[PDB]
Design a binder for this molecule. Structure first.
Ligand SMILES: *[C@@H]1O[C@H](CO)[C@@H](O[C@@H]2O[C@H](CO)[C@@H](O[C@@H]3O[C@H](CO)[C@@H](O[C@@H]4O[C@H](CO)[C@@H](O[C@H]5O[C@H](CO)[C@@H](O[C@@H]6O[C@H](CO)[C@@H](O)[C@H](O)[C@@H]6O)[C@H](O)[C@@H]5O)[C@H](O)[C@@H]4O)[C@H](O)[C@@H]3O)[C@H](O)[C@H]2NC(C)=O)[C@H](O)[C@H]1NC(C)=O
Ligand SMILES: *[C@@H]1O[C@H](CO)[C@@H](O[C@@H]2O[C@H](CO)[C@@H](O[C@@H]3O[C@H](CO[C@@H]4O[C@H](CO)[C@@H](O)[C@H](O)[C@@H]4O)[C@@H](O[C@H]4O[C@H](CO)[C@@H](O)[C@H](O)[C@@H]4O)[C@H](O)[C@@H]3O)[C@H](O)[C@H]2NC(C)=O)[C@H](O)[C@H]1NC(C)=O
Ligand SMILES: *[C@@H]1O[C@H](CO)[C@@H](O[C@@H]2O[C@H](CO)[C@@H](O)[C@H](O)[C@H]2NC(C)=O)[C@H](O)[C@H]1NC(C)=O
Ligand SMILES: OC[C@H]1O[C@@H](O[C@H]2[C@H](O)[C@@H](O)[C@H](O)O[C@@H]2CO)[C@H](O)[C@@H](O)[C@@H]1O
Ligand SMILES: [Fe+3]
Ligand SMILES: [Zn+2]
Ligand SMILES: [Zn+2]
Length: 341
């Protein structure tokens, strides 16, 4: 029964998984794929059991019958009395971020600028900002709004990939895994920090975690919060301290998904794995920490306090919420109810 196959996206997640596999005594083992979509296909086939997905991929997976099992829960200020595992999730803030020094760039002058996105099909990097831009321009030509972008997972020959860098060697340009230099929350924010793009579409937490010495990475060493501004939907620009009043949307947390018939068994194993390797785990500082990987967000986001039970045993639609799923569907009309595989 009780062995789980985790699906890793790309070589760096594979290496973290192998460490996790070793430390867990083979209670968890690892399958690897090059994209999140390929990982979803392995799960459907029964060749892997589970992986942690962004809200946008939970929508893809959900249509194919996969179900949310546990959600990432980060440290909050309210609901404090309750344990992390039983605490309701709060969601994260999708923001658009620019350099202070890039004056007079607001939400209404984004057209023909250079953009940095986490990956195609992701909540804060794609679904929210592009959904808003389609609604606002009344056009599905979102591939023509920005002059140049890095949007991992789009056509490498297109302008949506012009700004992506690939790996050390310039290989794998625009692949939607951490081999691409500008992939993910951290990568899209690096794309901005290095002045490759004019705007990054990330979440509030990314700015804080990579500025003011919170990251020791070479590119983030000297970044100061005051050098950045959030774009609000009313045309204003605000300090990064003002995210609660200047965000594009609130996003549902990343969540572990699995096949419906495997859900209960994945849940049981993961709850025990976190008692051992989670934030306060028997073995975390010492042997291995599940929620660490030097700001790279491998398998799980680094700011994760725990994986939390869901409560209300929600479907993927209830988990994502009616607001979010209607945004995705309206945007999906640009690029029809059924599994994409
Ligand atoms: C955008 O993204 C940012 C990055 O994620 C994020 O900033 C992060 O915020 C969190 C908290 O929301 C910070 O975590 C905090 O760190 C501190 C120390 O660094 C930790 O130490 C203590 O933790 C205690 C337990 O939670 C905390 O008590 C909490 O609960 C009590 C209720 O009993 C309450 O305290 C009250 O304070 C009142 C105000 O003075 C006072 O009058 C009253 O009497 C009472 O004492 C608070 O709710 C309190 O939080 C202690 O106070 C300590 O804080 C702790 O673990 C805590 O989680 C991150 O450090 C911070 N990240 C960074 C890198 O700076 C933003 O919040 C995000 N913004 C938006 C808009 O979402
Ligand atoms: C891009 O634009 C598209 C098109 O406009 C947007 O899609 C629309 O999104 C709207 C908001 O998500 C959505 O509006 C509707 O809102 C009503 C009212 O919501 C209610 O809210 C109450 C809060 O007090 C709550 O208690 C209620 O339960 C309820 O949720 C919704 O209700 C309708 O249906 C009822 C049937 O039971 C009916 O009686 C009632 O009169 C309402 O008509 C409704 O479900 C919906 O949420 C609207 O549906 C969307 N339009 C289309 C064409 O799909 C995208 O969101 C935009 N994208 C982005 C990124 O912003
Ligand atoms: C591998 O999984 C097994 C089965 O869950 C674990 O063995 C159990 O561990 C618990 C608590 O540590 C004990 O109380 C049980 O008696 C054990 N036997 C069972 C339930 O089969 C084992 O701990 C796991 N190994 C690691 C390191 O994760
Ligand atoms: O409009 C009726 C609609 O209610 C749904 O509840 C949504 C709600 O609309 C949304 O604002 C919130 O964020 O998410 C919940 C779902 O968790 C319900 O899901 C639908 O069945 C229903 O059509
Ligand atoms: Fe996300
Ligand atoms: Zn809001
Ligand atoms: Zn329900």
């Amino acid at each position: 029964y009780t062995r789980v196959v985790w699906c890793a996206v790309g070589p760096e997640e594979q290496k973290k998984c192998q460490q996790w596999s070793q430390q867990s005594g083979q209670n968890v083992t690892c399958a690897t794929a090059s994209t999140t979509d390929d990982c979803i296909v392995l799960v459907l086939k029964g060749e892997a059991d589970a992986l942690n997905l962004d809200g946008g991929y939970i929508y893809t997976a959900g249509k194919c019958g996969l179900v949310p099992v546990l959600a990432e829960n980060r440290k909050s200020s309210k609901h404090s009395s309750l344990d992390c595992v039983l605490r309701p999730t709060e969601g994260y803030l999708a923001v658009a971020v620019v350099k202070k020094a890039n004056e007079g760039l607001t939400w209404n002058s984004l057209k023909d600028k250079k953009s940095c996105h986490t990956a195609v099909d992701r909540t804060a990097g794609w679904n929210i900002p592009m959904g808003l831009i389609v609604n606002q321009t009344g056009s599905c030509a979102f591939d023509e709004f920005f002059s140049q972008s890095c949007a991992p997972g789009a056509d490498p020959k297109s302008r949506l990939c012009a700004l992506c860098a690939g790996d050390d060697q310039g290989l794998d340009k625009c692949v939607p895994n951490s081999k691409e230099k500008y992939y993910g929350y951290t990568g899209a924010f690096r794309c901005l920090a290095e002045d490759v793009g004019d705007v990054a579409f990330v979440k509030n937490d990314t700015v804080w975690e990579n500025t003011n010495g919170e990251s020791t990475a070479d590119w983030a060493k000297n970044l100061k919060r005051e050098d950045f501004r959030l774009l609000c939907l009313d045309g204003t620009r605000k300090p990064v301290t003002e995210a609660q009043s200047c965000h594009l949307a609130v996003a549902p947390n990343h969540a572990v998904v699995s096949r419906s018939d495997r859900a209960a068994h994945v849940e049981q194993v993961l709850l025990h794995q976190q008692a051992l390797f989670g934030k306060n785990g028997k073995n975390c500082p010492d042997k291995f920490c599940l929620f660490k990987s030097e700001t790279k967000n491998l398998l799980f986001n680094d700011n994760t306090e725990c994986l939390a039970k869901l409560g209300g045993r929600p479907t993927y639609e209830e988990y994502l919420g009616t607001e979010y799923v209607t945004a995705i569907a309206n945007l999906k009309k640009c690029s029809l109810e059924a599994c994409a595989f």
